[model samples]
Target: MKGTIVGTWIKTLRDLYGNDVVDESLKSVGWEPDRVITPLEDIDDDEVRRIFAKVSEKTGKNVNEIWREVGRQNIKTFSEWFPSYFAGRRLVNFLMMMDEVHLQLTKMIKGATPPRLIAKPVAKDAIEMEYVSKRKMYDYFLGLIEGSSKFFKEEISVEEVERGEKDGFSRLKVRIKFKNPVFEYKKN
Candidate 1:
């Protein structure tokens, strides 16, 4: 596996299960919690797989199950990081707005791909949204959106976008709009 993928998996485990699960899992096999593993560093996928397998052995959990659970749990981090992404004035308004982002992002990147996002109007104040990527693992996109949304928090529910192998590739567009009339003076 690529270091980015492995590093993501490790980070996801830490994010999802908390340092306890991850720490214990790592400690179960004598690895330190602060051990540095960079995405750019070359690593053996099989070694990485075996390391998780050790975690499975210690926790009595299946590796695949661990991966899935971690992947799902990592969304909260993204939400925390990118609150503006979900700050939809109205949920319906947000989804409709995303269509424009989709068009623009795709036009910007010829083959740039992203996962399908599930956008639901939760209430006038919130829109639940999620991201799903087809090519890479699902959480990769999820984390990206989460991070983006955290930085952007314009006010809105950001729920999960689904990624499937058959979904292929598309561009990602992020748009920001604010309703403060004071800024109107600055509009050209």
Candidate 2:
């Protein structure tokens, strides 16, 4: 995994929980609490998993929930960091473009393997999105979608279609229904 992801997770943890809690959690895992993380740096995903597990144990919280909340909160942080992706794009378009965006971003860094976001428009007000990766951060993926809905001021209902691991890959499919039509046609 990229250090940026792990770094953002750490920042989000401090933001949601207290700094003391996060610091203690990191220390418990034999990691320095104030280590610097660079965007181009590569980190072992197992180490990240262990860090989160330590945090979960310390806080008595589910590791999945922590990741999900971190993901949800990262939407705003990401938008602020990269505004062009969200600018002038509606929720549906933003989501649809994520696959390309993920590709482009990861390409800039060596050994970066971001999750694949395959989003397709299934109806005027709905989309079927698939999250494919070896990481299997399903809750985080859903949380980011939820955060996107909130960010765009669009209400949405998201239902998981399927989730499983196969052939060394983990996949999650979801059907997202928007409160209002994301596409419109006018007849003249």
Candidate 3:
């Protein structure tokens, strides 16, 4: 995982649940409360898991619950960090670009295996997206989608069409129905 990305997780945690929660969690990991996660460095995903588990212990909330909440707030932080990705001002456009975003990041960070987010329009008002990764972070994936809806102020219906593992990778497929049509045909 990229430190830049995990750094936002820390920021969102502090923002949403208050400093004490994150401070104690960091303390458990032998990290100072003001730990500076340098950008773009290779961070251990398992270390992130340990920190979140400590947070779960501190709050009595399940790890997945924490992930969903963190993901919901993550968009706002991401917007601040990477505004260009949010400039389109369209939920569909943002979601559709995620695959490319991963691809771009994979190139930016050598040997990084970012999650694959492949999305395509299935209808004028809907899209089908597939999430594939070894991380098995479906809850966070769903929450990011939920957060995107909120960030764009665009109402959407998300249905989990599939969730399973195959050949060593976790896969989640979601059918996302937009509140309004995103495409239409007109005389050309």
Candidate 3 has what TM-score? Answer: 0.93
Q: Candidate 1 versus the native: TM-score?
A: 0.38
- Clashing residue pairs, candidate 2? none
Between candidates 2 and 3, the one scoring higher on TM-score is 3
| lDDT score, candidate 1, position 163 | 26
Number of backbone collisions per candidate, in order?
Answer: 33, 0, 0
Tens-place lDDT digits, model 3, residues 97-168: 899888776576756888999998788899999999999998899999999999999999999898899888
Error of 3 at 56 (Å): 0.2
Error of 1 at 43 (Å): 2.6
lDDT of candidate 2 over 86-156, digit per residue (tens): 88788988899999988876786777678999998788899999999988888889889998988989899
Q: After superposition, how far is residue 107 of candidate 1 from its true place, in Å?
A: 21
Stretch of 10 with least lDDT, candidate 1: 176-185
Error of 2 at 131 (Å): 0.5
What would the per-residue lDDT of candidate 1 be over residues 105-180, giving only the tens digit for each residue?
A: 3453334443455554334344445444443444344444444434444332333333234446442322322322
Ranking, TM-score, top scorer first: 3, 2, 1
68 in model 2: Cα distance from truth in Å?
2.0
